[PDB]
């Protein structure tokens, strides 16, 4: 059920993408920092707790749902002078109490397998 379309929206956490590039790459929407976090957090919380780490993972590295067309969902790619590896590290902390502080499948605010 933790698959884009199903329990996770297609192209998930659009606002988290921008919140992450704001910080690591220095590019994003013209919205105050607190406003950028909120909107990402809000999006991550609309996802069922059990699928939160997976959503994060799809956003960091992408997912290819099967089907005739089935395009690549999510994934952080390189931006001029901002390698994908840099954005990944920060994206993995979103659930943390430092960041959105949201419980996952373990019932605790952390995604132990996400990063790498």
UniProtKB/Swiss-Prot annotation:
Superkingdom, natural source: Eukaryota
GO molecular function, one term: serine-type endopeptidase inhibitor activity
Keywords on record: Disulfide bond, Protease inhibitor, Secreted, Serine protease inhibitor, Signal
Subunit description: Monomer.
Cell location: Secreted
Cystine crosslinks: 2-51, 16-40, 25-82, 41-100, 53-111
Name listed for the protein in its UniProt record: Trypsin/factor XIIA inhibitor
Organism: Zea mays (Maize)
More info: The sequence heterogeneity suggests that 2 genes exist for this inhibitor. The genes may be alleles, or multiple loci could exist.
Family note: Belongs to the protease inhibitor I6 (cereal trypsin/alpha-amylase inhibitor) family.
């Amino acid at each position: 059920s933790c698959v884009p379309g199903w329990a996770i929206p297609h192209n998930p956490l659009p606002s988290c993408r921008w919140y992450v590039t704001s910080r690591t790459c220095g590019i994003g929407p013209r919205l105050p920092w607190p406003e950028l976090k909120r909107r990402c957090c809000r999006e991550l919380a609309d996802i069922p707790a059990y699928c939160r780490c997976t959503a994060l993972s799809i956003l960091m590295d992408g997912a290819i749902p099967p089907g005739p067309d089935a395009q690549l969902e999510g994934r952080l790619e390189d931006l001029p002078g901002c390698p994908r590896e840099v954005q990944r590290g920060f994206a993995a902390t979103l659930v943390t109490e430092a960041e959105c502080n949201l419980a996952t499948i373990s019932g605790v605010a952390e995604c132990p397998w996400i990063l790498g």
